[PDB]
Predict the structure.
Amino acid sequence: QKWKWWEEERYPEGIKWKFLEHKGPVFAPPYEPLPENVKFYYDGKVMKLSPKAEEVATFFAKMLDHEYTTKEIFRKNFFKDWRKEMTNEEKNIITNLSKCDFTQMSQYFKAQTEARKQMSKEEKLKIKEENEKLLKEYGFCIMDNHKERIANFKIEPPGLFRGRGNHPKMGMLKRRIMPEDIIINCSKDAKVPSPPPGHKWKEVRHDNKVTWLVSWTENIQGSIKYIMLNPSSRIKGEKDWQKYETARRLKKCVDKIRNQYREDWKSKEMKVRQRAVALYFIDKLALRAGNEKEEGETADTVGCCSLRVEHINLHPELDGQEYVVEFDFLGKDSIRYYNKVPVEKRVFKNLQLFMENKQPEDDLFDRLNTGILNKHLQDLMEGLTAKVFRTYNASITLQQQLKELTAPDENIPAKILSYNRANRAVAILCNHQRAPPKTFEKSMMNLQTKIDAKKEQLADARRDLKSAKADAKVMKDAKTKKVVESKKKAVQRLEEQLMKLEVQATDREENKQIALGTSKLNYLDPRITVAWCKKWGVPIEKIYNKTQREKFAWAIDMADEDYEF
DNA sequence: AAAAAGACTT
DNA sequence: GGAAAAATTTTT
DNA sequence: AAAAATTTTTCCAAGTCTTTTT
Ligand SMILES: CC[C@@]1(O)C(=O)OCc2c1cc1n(c2=O)Cc2cc3ccccc3nc2-1
């Protein structure tokens, strides 16, 4: 069937749904304590760990293999959070983490993973079926006249916080989410889901100005987690489509804004000059609008509006470049951003002004935050904020590079390479880095030995063709010529294969320290891709896989070859 | 405001 | 998501 | 048959910006 929601009339502003029914959240599987033969030791002598404490102790044991279990903060926060979940006949004995021996616990769990990957196609087939009966009853909710998929219906198990970067809270206990934390949400006329026996959910909500099915407040940050619908849904995809159409609207008056923020660098007020320089950073330098965040509750990271002075060092000349601003900081997810950038005359001079009589630990743009900057953007264009730039600059770069890369001649596998090269450019601009695949970049030697082997399979068809001509000369007939054809069409089938292997080795080695994912899904207007595919006859499945085709179902169907962002 | 929350987005 | 599992599928 | 190199899931947060509260 497949419901073409994009053909429907836009859902009237404010209300998200008229009717919402769902089976609720699936809870994390109960804890199975340790057997008799898996003993825990403290101060060398055996210790009986109560169910509560035993669990918190496993979470650490299973991580013993990682290098972070040796960091101060990790161990400090851990031990503190373990103390709470301990009995007094245990809070009296265990004074420190350092005297606790998890070695045996840690060993059993590495054995479980082994004994698991050695199962029978009877057990493995049963689990893979019991896992399918859960996805049917719990993974589909009903939102207005339709059956749509839920994204992550399984509530996350309790464990230990790690987070990304050097985070202050690493090692803390993530408590087990009970029904009494869950806030259900659904329509008044919908069958309310039944809670686990002998429990009550925190609240049965009916707020129809939201898209969520369930919410709870996790304890590490005190942030609210949600169980929202699958990206393939209407509610998620109309939002997605809107986000693109909003960045597409930015396109028709982008140069207008670029005229203004240019001369704004020459205004009376520092506040307007700051706002404009920051806007330059977000525009031409694809920075995020860096909100302020609670220090000692998150990893010290930034974005443009939050950039401290210590994140830049002013250089007049370097490598033959004029007015270079050296960026050096940890962006989102503690991912470094280093950029030597030649800026215009006023901008370099404006930055010196913004850094005068200031200490390294102070802001660059004081008198600025995301709030001021975004209030301006709104006035500049109906519905514009500072993230829309990243959507424009990323999307439009794909469209441009696909134009400047794709040649009509190329066979399908080299066009895929051209597309990926386009994607790659966006990725480097949006700084979606990657740590090289776990020493496995010797898979290149194991791909080169396959290419060098094909150079033989072809080299032999070349010397086969050279001898076919040496027989076609002496005694020329329609039996020798039609063989010099079968040896020519043979050089070709191998030539097209070598291309397919070499082009695929380039694609792989260029995308070594880059990440296309976050842009593939989150930043590029899927229609830009779809058009490119319809044009050169590249079957979509070569670019977007099934969950992607499904998420992007709206683009595929509602976009021709002629489409232009 | 403008902090502190909430709901989306990356 | 992006690296790690885990389930595959390719190589040897 | 079994090492090996792949494809695909599973594990687990950190931003942006709107709406409340204070
Ligand atoms: C590296 C890619 C990226 O950081 C990002 O910048 O954009 C996409 C993305 C990320 C992370 C994430 N998600 C994402 O959609 C969804 C999601 C769910 C999670 C659920 C639990 C823990 C971490 C989680 N991280 C992401």
